[PDB]
Design a protein around this ligand. Structure first.
Ligand SMILES: CCCCC/C=C\C/C=C\CCCCCCCC(=O)O
Ligand SMILES: CC(=O)N[C@@H]1[C@@H](O)[C@H](O)[C@@H](CO)O[C@H]1O
Ligand SMILES: CC(=O)N[C@@H]1[C@@H](O)[C@H](O)[C@@H](CO)O[C@H]1O
Ligand SMILES: *[C@@H]1O[C@H](CO)[C@@H](O)[C@H](O)[C@H]1NC(C)=O
Ligand SMILES: *[C@@H]1O[C@H](CO)[C@@H](O)[C@H](O)[C@H]1NC(C)=O
Ligand SMILES: *[C@@H]1O[C@H](CO)[C@@H](O)[C@H](O)[C@H]1NC(C)=O
Ligand SMILES: *[C@@H]1O[C@H](CO)[C@@H](O)[C@H](O)[C@H]1NC(C)=O
Lengths: 409, 170, 329, 48
């Protein structure tokens, strides 16, 4: 990465380079600064009303709650809360601080310890078949912690119920709160419980002297989406100003990238935050503070080529920028010689008004050579002869030559 | 190819049967791809070589075992002969050709009128050094005398554009 | 057809974009990009050799005379007119304006906003040819003037002038007809020739299909390459920045490797098909060179090679990515 | 020889059979089947 010649020598894997012209990587431009744009929010999320509550719900009638317009700084849980199980599925935990979440729902219930392994996408069992089921395409997090000091009573607490004896298996995020008599045999239950007709709900005991597997556990399931919509709920990152017409690193509501930001003529419907192109890349974005549409454009663009007379004679080179009209910015350096061919700006070569044959082709009728300096010139097709052609004159030979040539195949 | 190592013995020395199968499969896939690419490019090159060899055989049959009238096929000029020589992975043809060297200018006419009849050469051209009129062959100045054996008559002298008056002999 | 389009690919910009993680992950493979570009470079070098082998036979640039005292034959529609910047012919112009479509495209123009900008923003480059259209036209005019002033002599050495009707007499003798026929029906023959050239012009002022097929094929290929970037190849997303924004270094490497593999495969397929097409183009160009040497610089006795009928002469004209032969029989 | 045999391929029936899961999983790739069949169609047209 010192110069284009060294780029070439690394490409070929040799310290020596032969006469010619070589294509190199394209013209790159590196970002100057970094931009972050999140919404304007002040409230902190209700971590206490959710985690530090008074009574939870039963797994058969599990509770669900919406969360919106809040900052998700969870380090406030470190002083009080100690979780036994925490698992996130469509996201890594080391990234929860630099994202913004879209449709956040919290589900809450109480179960027995040995059943906690059942809160997962597959995991058949009593809890997953009849009480609570997660989908296969789940994006969110599961959290569980012991509560034997609150939900346990000496004589036994009998206020937490689970459903046994269902006819079929539940579907994802479905709830059944029916109290009907379950027919095990073929006898036709007339709404009474005899010997094959069961009440389908049962209770836990939850005594404090029980074993760690028969002790109560409080469970919270958080569900959300990422990077397709306004994303009201956000993290604790701090925002900056807007910078335009400059290559920057940016984070827009959790979406990171690199490029130049400009003003656009597009118009988004209120249920839109991002815009994609044919290749599914993000080309437009709405600002979460000003609400104006910005276009995104890359920074690296344009081909580059190197012209070399050979390292056994010189280390002088010329450089050709194919998409520049220097008559003068996007270049690795300026100098004393600039030509502006039809194949790009040529830097490092002297232009002469003569015409020779082609030694090193460049293009559009331009060739190069080494004289000592490097010269560029329009090449020659040959000489002029101007046959005579009178209407009564003829030329005829008076001698001959025997020629011998070679052809190799 | 997206694996912890490129050496099978490292993998097999620090991983078991179940955890090593993943990485070994990755390596297998990649190296198979490499061989496929090699064979494809060889197939594409062999066709170029075949075309060149067919051309060389055509040239040995048409330029060595005979005399060609095709232009710029067996050399540059008017073909006389050719000789083959062998070379590593190929053949070298030595083409012997005829070239005209020294040109001189002359005056022309398409026909000649003698007795109300037009005469044409039948093997050459009519030329004039300025006073006399000779008949000649085209690729070598060897002038002769205009007679009735090196000419043939066709019609009369009223239709040919450029005709000339002179004397035909016997 | 005589030539196709030249192309180059920056593989890092196509596969990884402006991401440094993908860039460092891609160094493992490494050799395959160098391989691909070696192949494409070979193709590009072969194209100019094709053009040169067809159009640059002679190295004497013969100028045409100002009298035009031919035997009633009129080559005004095939010879140049010193009036346009394209110092070329009537029919050559008609051909030029019948095929749609190297040059410069600045960043300021593509900034914000076609298909070419999208190609360029992903490392797909089209290179200009060495010989310009003006040079090819010069070559063609030189060949025409040589044929018209000297005959089949400028192809075997130095050009020896000869009157035109005297040359048509030779070319008649060559098909098995005497000279008296020519010198006795000169006027009729010239009028026929002129009306036939006029019919050619009138039918072209209202078929160039293969020269168009070539262009269309190339464009299709490059745009297919661009569109194949919306594929996931068995991964959670097709965008690297989503992956990198919701996943860490260890969990993202899996998906990034999947994407790398797939996009590499795509480029390989592109290069393979280009290799297979360049061979067709090469065969056609070799045929065209054989035809320029045997049908223009001489007179052929092969049947249905230089036209339909008994061959008398031929004239060349240039066309975008190819050549048009006018056979007189 | 003057001609060879013409062929067509339905890629879904080869890769996925009569399975709907594989069918829906295969929509991601998508372009490559169209590409293959374009090529084979060219061959078949060239034979005649
Ligand atoms: C007597 C054994 C017969 C086994 C028959 C063969 C295969 C059946 C396989 C597994 C059945 C046992 C599952 C036990 C777990 C119950 C579900 C749960 O509570 O998590
Ligand atoms: C998951 C589940 O049990 N769905 C049931 C379905 O089996 C039944 O057919 C329907 C009767 O209307 O009610 C509902
Ligand atoms: C009269 C009656 O059945 N009311 C009940 C309610 O007490 C119970 O809590 C609920 C389950 O959520 O089902 C209903
Ligand atoms: C949660 O409530 C407990 C019970 O009093 C208390 O000890 C703890 O400080 C609370 N956590 C918070 C949010 O401070
Ligand atoms: C660059 O811009 C100049 C305007 O001064 C223009 O005349 C020239 O044609 C452009 N260069 C090319 C070859 O595109
Ligand atoms: C034929 O005549 C032309 C016209 O003057 C002359 O220039 C040319 O040299 C002549 N050719 C030869 C072979 O002398
Ligand atoms: C050639 O044709 C054009 C137009 O028909 C015109 O120059 C003229 O008729 C011809 N040239 C002559 C007669 O000199």
């Amino acid at each position: 990465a010192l110069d284009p010649l060294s780029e070439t020598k690394c490409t070929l894997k040799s310290f020596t380079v032969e006469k010619g012209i070589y294509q190199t990587s394209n013209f790159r431009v590196q970002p100057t600064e970094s931009i972050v744009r999140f919404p304007n929010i002040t409230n902190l999320c209700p971590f206490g009303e959710v985690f530090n509550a008074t009574r939870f719900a039963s797994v058969y009638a599990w509770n669900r709650k919406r969360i919106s317009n809040c900052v998700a700084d969870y380090s406030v849980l470190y002083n009080s809360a100690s979780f036994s199980t925490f698992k996130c599925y469509g996201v890594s935990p080391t990234k929860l601080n630099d994202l913004c979440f879209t449709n956040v729902y919290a589900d809450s219930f109480v179960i027995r310890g040995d059943e906690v392994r059942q809160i997962a996408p597959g995991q058949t069992g009593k809890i997953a078949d009849y009480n609570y089921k997660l989908p296969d395409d789940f994006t969110g997090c599961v959290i569980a912690w012991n509560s034997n000091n609150l939900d346990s009573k000496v004589g036994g607490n009998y206020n937490y119920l689970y459903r046994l004896f269902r006819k079929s298996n539940l579907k994802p995020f479905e709830r059944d709160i029916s109290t009907e008599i379950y027919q095990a045999g073929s006898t036709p239950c007339n709404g009474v419980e005899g010997f094959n007709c069961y009440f389908p709900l049962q209770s836990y005991g939850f005594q404090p002297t029980n074993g760690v597997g028969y002790q109560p556990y409080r469970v919270v399931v958080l569900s959300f989406e990422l990077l397709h919509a306004p994303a009201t709920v956000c993290g604790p990152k701090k925002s900056t100003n807007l910078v335009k017409n400059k290559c920057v690193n940016f984070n827009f509501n959790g979406l990171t990238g690199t490029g130049v930001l400009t003003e656009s003529n597009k118009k988004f419907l209120p249920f839109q935050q991002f815009g994609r192109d044919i290749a599914d890349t993000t080309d437009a974005v709405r600002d979460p503070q000003t609400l104006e549409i910005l276009d995104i454009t890359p920074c690296s663009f344009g081909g580059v080529s190197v012209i070399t007379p050979g390292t056994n004679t010189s280390n002088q080179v010329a450089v050709l920028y194919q998409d520049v009209n220097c008559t003068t910015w996007r270049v690795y350096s300026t100098g004393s010689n600039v030509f502006q061919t039809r194949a790009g700006c040529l830097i490092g070569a002297e232009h002469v008004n003569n015409s020779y044959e082609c030694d090193i082709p460049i293009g559009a009728g331009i060739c190069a050579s080494y004289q000592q300096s490097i010269i560029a010139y329009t090449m020659s097709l040959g000489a002029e002869n101007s046959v005579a052609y009178s209407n009564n004159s003829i030329a005829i030979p008076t001698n001959f030559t025997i020629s011998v040539t070679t052809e190799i195949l | 190819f997206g694996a912890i190592s490129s050496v099978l013995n490292d993998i097999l020395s620090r991983l078991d049967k179940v955890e090593a199968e993943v990485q070994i499969d990755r390596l297998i896939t990649g190296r198979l791809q490499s061989l496929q690419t090699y064979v494809t490019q060889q197939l594409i090159r062999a066709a170029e070589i075949r075309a060149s060899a067919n051309l060389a055989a055509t040239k040995m049959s048409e330029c060595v075992l005979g005399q060609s009238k095709r232009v710029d096929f067996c050399g540059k000029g008017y073909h006389l002969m050719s000789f083959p020589q062998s070379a590593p992975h190929g053949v070298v043809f030595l083409h012997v050709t005829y070239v005209p060297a020294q040109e001189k200018n002359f005056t022309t006419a398409p026909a000649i009128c003698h007795d109300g009849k037009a005469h044409f050469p039948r093997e050459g051209v009519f030329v004039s050094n300025g006073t006399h009129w000779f008949v000649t062959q085209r690729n070598f100045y060897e002038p002769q005398i205009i007679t009735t054996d090196n000419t043939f008559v066709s019609g009369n002298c009223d239709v040919v554009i450029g005709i000339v008056n002179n004397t035909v002999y016997d | 057809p005589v030539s196709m389009t030249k192309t180059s690919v920056d593989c890092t910009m196509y596969i990884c974009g402006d991401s440094t993680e993908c860039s460092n992950l891609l160094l493992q493979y490494g050799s395959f990009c160098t391989q691909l570009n070696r192949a494409l470079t070979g193709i590009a070098v072969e194209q100019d050799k094709n053009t040169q082998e067809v159009f640059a036979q002679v190295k004497q640039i013969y100028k045409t005379p100002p009298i035009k005292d031919f035997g009633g034959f009129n080559f005004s529609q095939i010879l140049p007119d010193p009036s346009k910047p394209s110092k070329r012919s009537f029919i050559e112009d008609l051909l030029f304006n019948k095929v749609t479509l190297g040059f410069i495209k600045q960043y300021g123009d593509c900034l914000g906003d076609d298909l070419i900008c999208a190609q360029k923003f992903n490392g797909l480059t089209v290179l200009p040819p060495l010989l310009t259209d003006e040079m090819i036209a010069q070559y063609t005019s030189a060949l025409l003037a040589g044929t018209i002033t000297s005959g089949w002599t400028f192809g075997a050495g130095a050009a020896l002038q000869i009157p035109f009707a005297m040359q048509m007499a030779y070319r008649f003798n060559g098909i098995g007809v005497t000279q008296n026929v020519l010198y006795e029906n000169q006027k009729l023959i010239a009028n026929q020739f002129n009306s036939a050239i006029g019919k050619i012009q009138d039918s072209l002022s209202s078929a160039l299909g293969k020269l168009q097929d070539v262009v269309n094929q190339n464009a299709q290929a490059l745009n297919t390459l661009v569109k194949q970037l919306s594929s996931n190849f068995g991964a959670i997303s097709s965008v690297l920045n989503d992956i990198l924004s919701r996943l860490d270094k260890v969990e993202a490497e899996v998906q990034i490797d999947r994407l790398i593999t797939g996009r590499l495969q795509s480029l390989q397929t592109y290069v393979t098909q280009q290799l297979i097409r360049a061979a067709e183009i090469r065969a056609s160009a070799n045929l065209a060179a054989t035809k320029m040497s045997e049908c223009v610089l001489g007179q052929s006795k092969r049947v249905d090679f230089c036209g339909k009928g008994y061959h008398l002469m031929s004239f060349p004209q240039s066309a975008p990515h190819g050549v048009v032969f006018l056979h007189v029989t």
